[PDB]
Structures are given as structure tokens and as C-alpha cells.
Amino acid sequence: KRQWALEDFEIGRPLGKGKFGNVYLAREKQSKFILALKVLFKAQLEKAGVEHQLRREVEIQSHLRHPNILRLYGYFHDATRVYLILEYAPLGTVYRELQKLSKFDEQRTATYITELANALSYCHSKRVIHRDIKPENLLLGSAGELKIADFGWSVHAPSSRRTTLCGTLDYLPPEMIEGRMHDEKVDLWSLGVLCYEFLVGKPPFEANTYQETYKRISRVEFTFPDFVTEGARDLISRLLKHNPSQRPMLREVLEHPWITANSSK
Amino acid sequence: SSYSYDAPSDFINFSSGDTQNIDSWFEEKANLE
Ligand SMILES: Cc1cc(Nc2cc(N3CCN(C)CC3)nc(Sc3ccc(NC(=O)C4CC4)cc3)n2)[nH]n1
Numbered sequence: 020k021r022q023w024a025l026e027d028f029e030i031g032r033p034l035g036k037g038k039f040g041n042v043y044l045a046r047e048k049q050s051k052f053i054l055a056l057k058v059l060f061k062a063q064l065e066k067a068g069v070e071h072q073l074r075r076e077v078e079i080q081s082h083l084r085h086p087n088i089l090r091l092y093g094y095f096h097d098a099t100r101v102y103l104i105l106e107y108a109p110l111g112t113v114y115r116e117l118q119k120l121s122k123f124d125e126q127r128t129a130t131y132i133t134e135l136a137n138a139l140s141y142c143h144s145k146r147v148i149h150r151d152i153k154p155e156n157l158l159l160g161s162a163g164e165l166k167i168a169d170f171g172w173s174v175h176a177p178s179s180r181r182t183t184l185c186g187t188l189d190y191l192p193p194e195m196i197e198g199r200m201h202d203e204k205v206d207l208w209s210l211g212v213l214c215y216e217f218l219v220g221k222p223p224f225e226a227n228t229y230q231e232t233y234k235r236i237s238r239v240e241f242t243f244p245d246f247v248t249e250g251a252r253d254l255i256s257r258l259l260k261h262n263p264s265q266r267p268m269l270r271e272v273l274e275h276p277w278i279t280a281n282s283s284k
Numbered sequence: 285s286s287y288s289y290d291a292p293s294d295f296i297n298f299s300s301g302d303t304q305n306i307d308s309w310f311e312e313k314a315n316l317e
Contacts (some may be wrong), residue, residue: 084303092292
């Protein structure tokens with residue numbers, strides 16, 4: 020069959036500054052279909068030692084088919100580059116929305132949480148643990164629907180539990196901090212951290228030094244602002260359990276009365 | 285390297301919700317004996 024070639028795309032502007040300077044608005048030439056096209060340089064990958072991570076990320080995310088998970092339609096490479104052909108989400112990152120808004124009302128947060136739980140639920144039915152749930156790894160499409168975007172730390176854990184410390188400081192589950200093995204319940208932890216950052220504007224274990232944040236995550240030392248409503252506290256508290264075994268199932272999140280009372284049709 | 289992945293690199297006709305089989309790839313990879 021016909022394989023992708025760069026020549027199949029018209030390339031427009033970078034989608035983003037900084038760490039995203041890398042991903043372009045793109046167009047498939049015949050269909051005129053708008054895409055994001057992520058460009059990676061082989062030599063810099065191979066010098067960094069991260070090329071096997073890439074393999075895993077592509078293999079995983081290109082096989083996942085869900086409304087709230089950004090399609091990776093395909094990839095290809097040439098002498099110098101690897102290209103990832105990704106779904107374009109025109110409304111940008113949840114993180115930008117949080118920056119713009121400061122914190123989200125209850126309806127929006129519950130809707131984001133519903134959408135997201137649905138995506139991870141489906142992910143977990145596949146034995147995939149995401150392992151990097153956080154506002155930047157989340158994108159918004161046309162209708163403002165949530166899509167999971169970054170599968171750079173995700174793993175297919177079909178049988179064996181995992182040892183790899185990965186994720187983002189403020190979102191690390193306690194089992195990772197303490198160097199114990201971990202399973203899919205990490206995503207439940209980070210979900211609770213996220214639901215908190217959504218409503219408050221900052222994550223619950225924020226500290227000056229990472230040393231001090233590690234410690235607060237392990238002791239589960241955090242507090243809620245007065246404005247956080249009882250149902251939101253309950254949910255967050257349920258998700259933020261030191262013992263991963265104590266964390267709810269995603270179907271439970273989806274059926275939580277704060278979530279149901281607050282998410283949309 | 286092997287930039288040869290167990291992943292789609294075939295041209296897609298974008299100009300036309302169910303390609304259901306595709307994610308079967310997970311349980312099959314788990315089902316590898
Ligand atoms: C891949 C992708 C990106 C998009 N959409 C956008 C959109 C965007 N915009 C900037 C802000 N205005 C409000 C409109 C949208 N800015 C970025 S900047 C950006 C770029 C990439 C990523 N994420 C990734 O590359 C994920 C795959 C690892 C996040 C933000 N990405 N659709 N699909």
C-alpha cells in the first residue's frame with residue numbers, strides 16, 4: 020500500500036511556542052484536511068536515548084480509538100526526521116484555558132472530569148495506563164470537548180506492574196515517590212490532583228522545593244479553600260488515597276453525585 | 285534505527301465513526317504466548 024510522504028502535506032505555522040514549537044498546522048494536499056504534524060529529529064532522539072520511548076508512544080496512541088483521545092492517524096519518517104500525524108484540536112490546551120480563567124466553575128470541571136474518566140476507562144479496558152494526566156496534556160476540540168493528547172509516558176501493562184518513575188512533579192502518585200511498584204491506580208490519583216487544580220487554580224501539593232512536594236504527596240498533606248463545595252471535597256478526597264487499592268473505580272467517579280449533578284446533557 | 289513501528293503509516297483518504305477492529309491490537313499483543 021501507499022505510504023505517507025512529506026510531499027503529501029502543506030505545512031503552515033507552528034501551533035505553539037516553546038516545547039510545542041515542534042508541531043505545525045498541516046494540510047493533507049488532496050483532501051485539504053487539517054492536521055497537526057509533529058516533527059522530531061532522529062539524531063537528537065538517538066543522542067538523548069529516547070527513541071524506544073517514541074516507538075512505544077506511537078504504537079500505543081495510534082491504536083486508541085475514542086472521542087476524548089486525540090487521534091494519532093499515522094506516522095512516517097525520512098533520512099533525518101520522524102513525523103507524527105495527529106488530530107488537530109482547534110481550541111488548544113485545557114492548561115491555557117486555566118491560565119485564561121484562573122479556575123473552572125463546577126459545571127465545566129465535572130464535564131471535564133466526566134469526559135476524562137470516560138477516556139481513561141477506555142484506556143484501562145486496553146490495559147493502558149496514561150501516567151501523565153495534567154492540564155497541558157489535555158486539548159480541546161471544536162465543541163470544547165476534552166481530548167487526551169500526550170501519551171509520552173503511557174504504557175501497555177497487560178499483566179506485570181510497573182517500576183518506571185514518570186510524570187510531572189505535582190502529579191506524581193505516592194507509590195512512585197516511595198519507589199514501590201505501581202499499576203493503573205496512578206491515573207486515579209492524578210485525576211484527583213487535576214480535579215483540584217481545575218477548581219482551585221493550583222495543584223494540592225505545591226511547594227517551593229521538590230523535596231518538600233514529594234514529602235507532602237507521601238503524607239497526603241493538603242487542604243481545600245473555603246469555596247470548594249462538600250461534593251467536590253468528597254470526590255477529591257476519595258481519589259487522593261495513599262493506598263492505591265483504596266482509590267475508586269472510574270465507573271464510580273462517573274457515577275459520583277457531584278459529577279452527575281454538575282456535568283452536562 | 286528501526287524507525288519501523290507496529291503502527292499505521294499507510295496513506296489515508298481523509299475526505300470520507302467505526303473502524304472497530306483496530307484496537308483489537310492490544311489484547312492480541314497481550315494474547316501473544
Ligand atoms: C497536536 C495538536 C495540537 C492541537 N491544537 C493546538 C491548538 C493551539 N491553539 C493555541 C491557542 N488558541 C486558543 C487556539 C489553539 N495550540 C496548540 S500548542 C500545542 C501543541 C501540541 C500539544 N500536544 C502535543 O503535541 C501532544 C501530542 C503530544 C499541545 C499544545 N495546539 N491539535 N492537535
